[PDB]
Amino acid sequence: EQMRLPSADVYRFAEPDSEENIIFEGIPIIKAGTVIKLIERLTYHMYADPNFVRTFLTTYRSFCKPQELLSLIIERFEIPEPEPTEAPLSAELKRFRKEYIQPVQLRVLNVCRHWVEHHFYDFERDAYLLQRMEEFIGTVRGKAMKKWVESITKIIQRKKIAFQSSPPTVEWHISRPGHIETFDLLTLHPIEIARQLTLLESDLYRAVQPSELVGSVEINSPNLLKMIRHTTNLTLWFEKCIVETENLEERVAVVSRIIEILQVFQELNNFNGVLEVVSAMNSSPVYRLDHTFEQIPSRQKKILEEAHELSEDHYKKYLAKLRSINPPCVPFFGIYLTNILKTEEGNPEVLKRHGKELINFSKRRKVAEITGEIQQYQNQPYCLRVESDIKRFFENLNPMGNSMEKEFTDYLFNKSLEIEPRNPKPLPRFPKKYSYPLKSPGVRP
Numbered sequence: 001e002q003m004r005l006p007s008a009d010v011y012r013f014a015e016p017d018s019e020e021n022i023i024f025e026g027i028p029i030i031k032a033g034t035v036i037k038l039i040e041r042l043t044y045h046m047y048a049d050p051n052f053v054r055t056f057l058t059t060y061r062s063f064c065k066p067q068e069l070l071s072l073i074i075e076r077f078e079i080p081e082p083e084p085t086e087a088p089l090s091a092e093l094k095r096f097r098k099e100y101i102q103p104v105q106l107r108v109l110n111v112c113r114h115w116v117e118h119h120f121y122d123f124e125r126d127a128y129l130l131q132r133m134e135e136f137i138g139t140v141r142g143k144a145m146k147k148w149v150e151s152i153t154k155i156i157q158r159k160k161i162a163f164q165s166s167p168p169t170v171e172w173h174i175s176r177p178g179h180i181e182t183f184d185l186l187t188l189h190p191i192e193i194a195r196q197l198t199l200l201e202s203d204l205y206r207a208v209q210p211s212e213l214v215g216s217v218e219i220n221s222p223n224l225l226k227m228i229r230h231t232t233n234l235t236l237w238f239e240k241c242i243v244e245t246e247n248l249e250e251r252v253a254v255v256s257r258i259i260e261i262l263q264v265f266q267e268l269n270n271f272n273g274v275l276e277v278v279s280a281m282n283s284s285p286v287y288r289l290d291h292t293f294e295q296i297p298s299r300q301k302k303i304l305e306e307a308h309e310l311s312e313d314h315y316k317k318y319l320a321k322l323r324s325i326n327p328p329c330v331p332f333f334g335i336y337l338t339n340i341l342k343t344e345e346g347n348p349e350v351l352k353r354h355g356k357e358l359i360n361f362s363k364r365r366k367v368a369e370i371t372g373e374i375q376q377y378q379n380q381p382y383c384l385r386v387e388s389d390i391k392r393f394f395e396n397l398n399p400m401g402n403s404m405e406k407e408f409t410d411y412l413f414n415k416s417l418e419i420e421p422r423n424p425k426p427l428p429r430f431p432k433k434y435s436y437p438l439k440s441p442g443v444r445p
């Protein structure tokens, strides 16, 4: 059964399995290994391993550069034949071609095909990486393998090239259409604020590739960064709109309008937006505004209290709602980032055996299983009309200005103490900052 393989100095993937290079947990599950050993099992001669191909291509950037992965799979493909025994039947050589060279070479090409189909951004970010891939597959000879080169070439071409019902009418309130200079929390219609923020957040959620969350929660993660900045900017914008409205009556109208935006986020199944509002309402500057929340109606308090209970017990009620909901939806994105940090903290980058270092692949596998849950909600377009001016208003939100986040939250907290001083101190009287009406048009379209 064991075949005659080429020398380890002429082919690096021929080294036997040992505790210095691979550790396993009916395909065996890899716990840890060197990059050479991971690449070997990624293109194993004995069997196909699509779950390992999927997980490896999502996580390898946390232990290997794309340029190194390409160099190593080319090295894996270029198998030298062992030296003959002075020779001819050539039984072991014919069998080495059939049972080792052919399956490994086919498996390298299957890894290339999965790499260009599901992770083309690696090639978009580095033109020379694509140039090397196209050059490598171009040197592949043989009819059976030219079919794999044709499919890889068609996928590269395809990647280079790249309503269910009638959407409802766009809603307007004080700010007339196109009057961008007046666009603000109380001047735009609360329904349209919630519809446009949902389209913005649905596009941002859909643009996040699973690999962007591996070993990182800039080039590596552009869409994750844009998603996190949006959530920070929108949450802090809600807080700023609340505490910078010093007049009690106007601040009640601001808080009440944000709760109405949350109701429409609930109707739209935008759980990301629901929990952005909850996060703003639970922040230290807002949560302590007892005089403000005293004037909020009971029905609006119930809405906000129930939206908070979605996060209790590690998001228990949220997960039940998400599963029981019909698309379209925008799932809460923060939970993936929390679970990835919980998985990665205290989890070692490497295992050490006999002075040698092995990459901890279990750590990468557990992160991939979390990120794999993101994609099932990324092909759910909303049946809502985009409003370019409102979208641009929410894209350019910059509440912090030049401040750093922590310092800005301390400013928000001190603004909260100015507008509602602590119990002994009197409640001051502040002038009105808005001359337009505060009455909401409601959440009914």
Ligand SMILES: Cc1nc(N[C@H](C)c2cc(N)cc(C(F)(F)F)c2)c2ccccc2n1
Residues within 6 Å of the ligand: 278, 281, 282, 286, 287, 288, 293, 296, 300, 301, 302, 304, 305, 306, 307, 308, 309
């Ligand atoms: C049911 C619940 N809700 C919460 N926070 C929500 C988001 C809320 C915030 C603010 N600021 C005002 C209201 C209200 F009710 F007055 F409108 C509600 C909690 C926050 C911390 C601990 C337990 C919590 N339990």
